[PDB]
Design a binder for this molecule. Structure first.
Ligand code: NDP
Ligand code: NDP
Ligand code: 55V
Ligand code: 55V
Lengths: 157, 157
């Protein structure tokens, strides 16, 4: 199983200046709930934004930088390597990895952030022609989660 | 001057179940700055959501209820009475007063909430064909103000 895991806004913004344009705890919970005990594949710039690997899962970083060495983090150097990773693998970002993998994944877990933010990185366009809505769940709002959001699970037709 | 004063979302939602669907401190300050020392005109249901008049300005409530009696609150019974109120009058809501007044105001101060919220009351459709953008200012996001928003001042051509 190859899955995309992404949060994007109404215009498909996923980031600004190497950061998330919003903070939504319930979505971090959704990421944790889904990828804990599985595998995350991510591009080099996305990793730098985190700095430390995420606990209780395999962290895999894609980069051409051949001297790349961070502890608790596995390194790969081409897209072809991704298919040799075992288990549920989540394409975790960022923009360039999402662009390379959208045509290859079996399904997508997309959190639609129901708002318009300033961004400089984007999730690629996609149409509901190619994607079956397996589920759509409206995010619950409270004092920590103030932007409306929708959990979509999309499966390639 | 007869002005509209409103906060609406990307689908022109202004309320849900007689409350605001969001909380935006910077927009409350925008209301304070703009209306203090002038007049707010509002519908009965909008008033009942507040309960007490707002400080440092004339509060006028529109209702057909001839028994309506609240201290600090002026009462009118026809739309025609709005035109005999002196100074800068802000049409303050809600949906029904906005519907009655949109074709009559000189201008509108609209805070666009750049998100999609669940609502049951709406600001009427308007086109930028009939309205000049006097100013458009991006709201500043901090820890207390988490939803993107834009302050619009629109003037009838
Ligand atoms: N909202 C969301 O769901 C998420 C948002 N983001 C956001 O995305 C932005 C970062 O995205 P972006 O700038 O595109 O960068 P990426 O995170 O996708 O990193 C790009 C890097 O990945 C490496 N790489 C990509 N493809 C290959 C390949 N085929 N072979 C070898 N190496 C490859 C290269 O590294 P190198 O140059 O070292 O060789 C490249 O510079 C940030 O703003 C971040 O916040 C990220 C994930 C999720
Ligand atoms: N986001 C925003 O900028 C704002 C949002 N709101 C929201 O709007 C919603 C309320 O809107 P809505 O339900 O339409 O109610 P309104 O506040 O507009 O009031 C409706 C009532 O106003 C009185 N009224 C209106 N027109 C007349 C008239 N021509 N003659 C006599 N009386 C009149 C009537 O009261 P009566 O029945 O007693 O005669 C009518 O029932 C709330 O959810 C509130 O949160 C409100 C203001 C701003
Ligand atoms: C999972 O937590 C983080 C996610 C992220 C990124 C931005 C890389 C992500 C993501 C992501 C989110 C938040 N939601 C969904 N649905 N998918 C994603 N890939 C960065 C972090 O550092 C700031 C994180 O915490 C340390
Ligand atoms: C401005 O104060 C309030 C406004 C309001 C309403 C919702 C009536 C309003 C409004 C309004 C806002 C928030 N922004 C803009 N730009 N215009 C408005 N008319 C309700 C309140 O309590 C329930 C308020 O606090 C006392």
């Amino acid at each position: 199983t190859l899955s995309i895991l992404v949060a994007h806004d109404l215009q498909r913004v996923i980031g600004f200046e190497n950061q998330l344009p919003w903070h939504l705890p319930n979505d971090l919970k959704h990421v944790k709930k889904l990828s804990t005990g599985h595998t995350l594949v991510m591009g080099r710039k996305t990793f730098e934004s985190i700095g430390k690997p995420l606990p209780n899962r395999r962290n895999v970083v894609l980069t051409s930088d051949t001297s790349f060495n961070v502890e608790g983090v596995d390194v790969i150097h081409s897209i072809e390597d991704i298919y040799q990773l075992p288990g549920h693998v989540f394409i975790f970002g960022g923009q360039t990895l999402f662009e390379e993998m959208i045509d290859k994944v079996d399904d997508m877990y997309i959190t639609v952030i129901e708002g318009k933010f300033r961004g400089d990185t984007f999730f690629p366009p996609y149409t509901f022609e190619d994607w079956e809505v397996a589920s759509s769940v409206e995010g619950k709002l409270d004092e920590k989660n103030t932007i409306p959001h929708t959990f979509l699970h999309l499966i390639r037709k």
